[PDB]
């Protein structure tokens, strides 16, 4: 939808449910109260980005960040095929609806409830249909023909090609390359000139800097003392990292880089003497990946 994002339509799991049913076996109308809440359960409000609980085809894997642009369902009721679309402002809103009803004599009122599981997100009462039929008379069961959703996610980071920036989530600072002990060393900064390229091989992920002052020494790695420097490409697991998120990596992803040799140590911030980007034991700081325009 926005600069650096892509909208993808995808098939979603939608289901009807008898939301409310009142069987008026007696003569004259009887009144009861009923209230519903149309919208997504446990909406963050501070953000519309939803992390996945379960998959959505091949596009969305678990733990992936997406945004629901819309949800579209096609339903067949009483031999009458129609369809309803739910805009983005409707899914992330908690719309509360309340009202009493007077059911006709010797009749069964039915309010069918439609819900959606768009990658974990439980959109309750997407739609409803108030069907009323006499007691005994076979009512129509609404079926789902095609349930789909339009989701926004972030441009795909093509490994070994797309140039990105690796920002600290908490400090909102970019990871830069400075000199430390005559070697390229990682440290936080505000400069948006420090770009990187992510690779992946048998040994894990690699972080190739494009801004090394010592040419050739360009792959981020953890030393034995814990600090982060850049070295020439080798099969050394100290320059290999493990990302918590599943592939593919997209723009705006929030990830944690865990070293492959120092399996319990992860890429983090630590007020050091010369630099502040380290790879320390029992530490798993979050970093934001973002594509350059
Ligand atoms: C003239 C003489 C008159 C006397 C003659 C005798 C006739 C009497 C018989 C009348 C009985 C009618 C049947 C009773 C109505 C049942 C109501 C019902 O089934 N519906 C439920 C539907 O669940 P929810 O809407 O809560 O979904 C909640 C969904 N969540 C998971 C999001 C929370 C609700 C609670 O109400």
Residue numbers in the entry: 5 to 297
Can you list sentences taken from the study reporting this PDB entry?
Lysenin from the earthworm Eisenia fetida is a pore-forming protein that specifically interacts with sphingomyelin (SM) and may confer innate immunity against parasites by attacking their membranes (Bruhn et al., 2006; Cooper et al., 2001). The structure reveals that lysenin has two domains. The topology of the lysenin structural fold establishes it as a member of the aerolysin family of pore-forming proteins (Szczesny et al., 2011), which appears thus to be conserved from bacteria to annelids. Here we report the crystal structure of lysenin alone, and in complex with the sphingomyelin headgroup phosphocholine (POC), and with SM itself.
The crystals exhibited two molecules in the asymmetric unit, one bound to SM and one not. The SM-bound copy has a different conformation in subdomain 1 of the PFM to the protein structure without SM bound, because it has opened up into a more loosely packed arrangement. To our knowledge, this is the first crystal structure of SM bound to a protein and it shows simultaneous recognition of hydrophilic and hydrophobic portions of the lipid. A binding site for the lipid head group at the top of the PFM is partnered by interaction with one of the two hydrophobic tails of a pair of aromatic residues on the edge of a β sheet. The single SM hydrophobic tail resolved is held nearly parallel to a β strand of the PFM by the side chains of Tyr24 and Tyr26, which form van der Waals interactions with the SM tail, creating a sort of aromatic platform to hold the tail in place.
